[PDB]
């Protein structure tokens, strides 16, 4: 699925976003690699 250290989650409106546990950031953008 996702590259190492990354987690897929959902916000309060059900919208998918991504959690970067390597650098402690979040983004709407799915990581490519």
């Amino acid at each position: 699925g996702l590259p190492s250290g990354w987690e897929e989650r959902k916000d309060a409106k059900g919208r998918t976003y991504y959690v970067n546990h390597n650098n402690r950031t979040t983004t709407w953008t799915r990581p490519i690699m």
Partner: peptide, 11 residues
């Protein structure tokens, strides 16, 4: 608007 913030307690 932005996504939820990183969960800082999880650090």
């Amino acid at each position: 608007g932005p996504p939820p913030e990183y969960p800082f307690k999880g650090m």
